[PDB]
Amino acid sequence: MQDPIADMLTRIRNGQAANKAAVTMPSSKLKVAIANVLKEEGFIEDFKVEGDTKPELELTLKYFQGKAVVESIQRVSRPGLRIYKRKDELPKVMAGLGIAVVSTSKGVMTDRAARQAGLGGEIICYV
Amino acid sequence: ALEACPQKRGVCTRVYTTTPKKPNSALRKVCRVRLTNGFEVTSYIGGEGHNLQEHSVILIRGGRVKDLPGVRYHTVRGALDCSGVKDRKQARSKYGVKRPK
RNA sequence: CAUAACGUCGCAAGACCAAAGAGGUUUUCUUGCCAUCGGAUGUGCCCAGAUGGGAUUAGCUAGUAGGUGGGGUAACGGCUCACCUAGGCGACGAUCCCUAGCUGGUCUGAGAGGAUGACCAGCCACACUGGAACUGAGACACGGUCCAGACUCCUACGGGAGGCAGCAGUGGGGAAUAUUGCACAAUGGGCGCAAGCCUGAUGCAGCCAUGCCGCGUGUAUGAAGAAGGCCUUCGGGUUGUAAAGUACUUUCGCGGGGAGGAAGGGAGCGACGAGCUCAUUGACGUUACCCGCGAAGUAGCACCGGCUAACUCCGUGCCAGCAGCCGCGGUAAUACGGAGGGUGCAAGCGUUAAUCGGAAUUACUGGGCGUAAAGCGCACGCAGGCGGUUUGUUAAGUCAGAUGUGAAAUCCCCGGGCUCAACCUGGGAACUGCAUCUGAUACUGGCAAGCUUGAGUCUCGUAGAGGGGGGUAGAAUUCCAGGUGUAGCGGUGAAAUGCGUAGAGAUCUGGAGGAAUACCGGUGGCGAAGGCGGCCCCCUGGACGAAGACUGACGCUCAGGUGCGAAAGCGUGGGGAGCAAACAGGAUUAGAUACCCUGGUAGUCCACGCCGUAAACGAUGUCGACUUGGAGGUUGUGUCUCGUGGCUUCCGGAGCUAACG
RNA sequence: UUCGGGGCGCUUACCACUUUGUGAUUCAUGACUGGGGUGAAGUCGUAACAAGGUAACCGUAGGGGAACCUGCGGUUGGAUCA
RNA sequence: UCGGGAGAAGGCACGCUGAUUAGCUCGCCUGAUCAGUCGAAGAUACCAGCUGGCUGCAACUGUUUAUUAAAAACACAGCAC
RNA sequence: GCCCCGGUAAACGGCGGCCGUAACUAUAACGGUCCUAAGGUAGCGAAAUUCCUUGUCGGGUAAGUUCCGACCUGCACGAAU
């Protein structure tokens, strides 16, 4: 697509709204890298590579009473206008509660993970 | 004022009287002045009495007279030929009136 | 004219070309000269990027673009010339027009940004107006020169002298901006070996609250509480410890003292050299400051309806006047004028003019477009922008390390110095951008290779008022012909005009012509829109389903361009039953140059040509993905009381909307 | 003048500013003229509002102080218990 | 009515002589180059428009008073009955 | 054929008096009231068609009975006369 990352993000946003057990999304190393932080942070149960011939990423969403595990999630860095942040520019989503995934040379990491390593990059999205 | 000047001199063309608008009634004293700016506007003449003739020549301050539509300027009394109000025991700052002994 | 350290020119590894003394502690130094190399510093030229407003400023250009040769200069270059070629530039906006010295910085703002660039510092451009060149390291040069022009002054008029946008000053202008003052000793500059000379550069004083900071017009005491003014239920209350008065200090002023800011020349020792030693001399000032003496010793301005903090009485009376906005005043006004009192500030206080944000009201951070302002009428399509999955190379964008640059000052932080502060000094921290070197390369870009789930195609079928041309029926109206016929018909709210016994209306039959298409029709259907509806044939577009067979992402949008695009009316020709602007009359009416009634032209109809608009409205463009269902209908398929694909409606989950939806 | 030549001078090509013709633009003034804004009680009629006491809108055409009126055609986002 | 208006306007050159170049097969053909040079004047004779603007009339070419009027008078394609 | 009726103007034509309103005054402009039906709507003026007239205002000029523009009650403007 035009911006696969945004698509995946949306396919999960719309999937959770319907409270679906699992959701499919076209595989891609970058995507998997992202899904990795989502599972570790506790936004998703996990994921798995699926597809008879076409590589997919079966995302197993999880929910709780009252609020949804992933209250909000949107891409801030789009192809039309990319955004880059410095070590000190990394914004704190909901004062820690929420996190942001950034793409640095060290690899895809969260605000805290990137803050620790001491590097900045392209702000993929906020969750 | 053209050159965004605080004041501007000019020579009176005619010192006639005008009547207020719908809500008011009187004989307000005005006068057409040909400022050095190259404009011929009408200015109000504050005070109970003045001594402005045809070749008066006075400085313009700038102020709209709500009652008289068109009069957007006030004449500065105490300058040039415009003699300050006589027997002004009050606000002498305006009307240009020296403090009596 | 000599020597050649060298340097220049041809070829290659040859030939040519230079230069003044003087002074002395005079056989020894000092000043200076000639040639060459280098140092120091300052510049000429070129290049990348950046540098306001208007396209109602679009095609522009002949040396104009390039080439060869030559000329020219310190040097490149059409810079200039001859010849040849014919190009060069433009919507990333040339050319033309308008405007303004530019910058470091300054003011403002959270930032971005906006405004500005006056003091000081850098650069640029100008001295009677215009032009030009010479001499030189340099000025094309204010007190240098040449020419043209006006003006002023001098003049025995023959002919000459000048040019304050240099300092001060005069007159004129304006709302407005100063001593035609003192002085070189100090610092700095020019010349000289030096002594020394020159230096309104500058250091100071003067004038002006123009601004900033500091200070004074007094301090303590002093009545349940003077007088006066003010209010009063006249009992009293208020101005008030406020003044008077007592005690204390005592800004001005007077007397005395009196500053920092400044060494050599010379002389002595030493070789009047290095070095050492010693002596003479100052604007602001007799001011600052110190000591002594010592009198209480100017205050004003604005405001008090609300925003704005601070109240009554009297006068006036929509009269006089007030007013930034809302407003106030026509006899009780805290917003008019005065007074008492009160608030603010203080030699200051007000007024006028100008700059800043609030405005998320151009919104990059921060916005909107169905009805509040807002999708261009549609299509096609150029440039441009954007672009699917996998692999490899490059790595330009992007990112990282190092390094150079980023003047001073300023700003920020800390400490320090003048008694504080302003001001100043030292140190510290941050800095985008750009150049250089090295590295990574996930993403974008480029090159190379590869893939189908997009798109297109093929085969077999399907429905439709899609479009163009030609050909075809019945009803009704009008006119014409024949037959048969009565006294009224017609029209209106009611009537009348009008028509009628040389005969219509009404009725039957036959003929002609033009136009439109009565049920079905629908709340329906088709087309891109406008529009389009009897049937037949020919020509032609779009579209849907099945089989999955073929190519294979060849895409999306689209400034300009091109094409299409209701109605109206218009041009030429033709036609004209009916209807009907203008208009002819009759009625209605206060009038009707309306509605109502009787006539009636263009037009309405056909052919060809013209325009480009519209509530051209779902007043909400195209494509893809995702998000409950229920019900009706058109069409294909399927294991067909139902599943599935495309299309057309209605009701509705979530959600969306100001509300309607 | 060492006659080799140079300097003076003379002549000639090139040259601010001005003149002539045409063209573009700005400015001051201006007959006559068009409409407009504003101003307690002048005037003619009465269109709209108002379902209000004759529907609106629209393309076009003409007129009128104006909104608007009227004519032709169209639409309804046309009224009403009959 | 792009045909035109336009030889609009305006400005310059335009003699002779020498030595040459270019076009052509050539001309006693044509177009230029360099240098020198004379007059007040070089198309030194001869031929040969004055130009611009405003207004009225008729559209235009054309026709008409052979012996005073050619004119805004007549005619004209077109339009109409 | 005429009287009579009606169609036809690509034959002769017509378009007044008064009141209110309004203006500083007079006029024009609009409606009506009356006479004889209407009283000039759509269009056009001192015009080569206006006498009075070198009409009035004004531009332009030192001065223009000229010209141009406007007003305009146009002695007897007007649609294929």
Curated annotation (Swiss-Prot), chain A:
Gene Ontology terms for molecular function: rRNA binding; structural constituent of ribosome
Cysteine disulfide partners in this protein: none
Database matches in InterPro entries: Ribosomal_uS8, Ribosomal_uS8_CS, Ribosomal_uS8_sf
Gene Ontology biological process terms from the UniProt entry: cytoplasmic translation; regulation of mRNA stability; regulation of translation; ribosomal small subunit assembly
UniProtKB keywords: Repressor, Ribonucleoprotein, Ribosomal protein, RNA-binding, rRNA-binding, Translation regulation
Domain of life: Bacteria
GO cellular component, one term: cytosol
Keyword Ribonucleoprotein: yes
Gene3D superfamilies associated with the record: 3.30.1370.30, 3.30.1490.10
The keyword Iron-sulfur belongs to this UniProt entry's keyword annotation: no
General function of this protein: One of the primary rRNA binding proteins, it binds directly to 16S rRNA central domain where it helps coordinate assembly of the platform of the 30S subunit. Protein S8 is a translational repressor protein, it controls the translation of the spc operon by binding to its mRNA.
Family per similarity comment: Belongs to the universal ribosomal protein uS8 family.
NCBIfam families for the chain: PRK00136.1 (NF001109)
Family matches, as HAMAP family: Ribosomal_uS8_B
Subunit field text: Part of the 30S ribosomal subunit. Contacts proteins S5 and S12.
Name of the protein described by the UniProt record: Small ribosomal subunit protein uS8
UniProtKB/Swiss-Prot annotation, chain B:
One Gene Ontology term, aspect cellular component: cytosol
Residue(s) carrying 3-methylthioaspartic acid: 67
GO biological process: cytoplasmic translation; Group I intron splicing; maintenance of translational fidelity; positive regulation of RNA splicing; response to antibiotic; RNA folding; translation
Consequence of substituting residue 66 to Q: Confers low-level resistance to streptomycin and a 15% decrease in the translational elongation rate
A molecular-function term among this protein's GO annotations: structural constituent of ribosome
Listed transmembrane segments: none
Disulfide bonds: none
Keyword set, alphabetical order: Acetylation, Antibiotic resistance, Methylation, Ribonucleoprotein, Ribosomal protein, RNA-binding, rRNA-binding, tRNA-binding
Sequence similarity: Belongs to the universal ribosomal protein uS12 family.
Protein name as annotated: Small ribosomal subunit protein uS12
Native organism: Escherichia coli (strain K12)
Residues of the full protein shown: 23 to 123 of 124
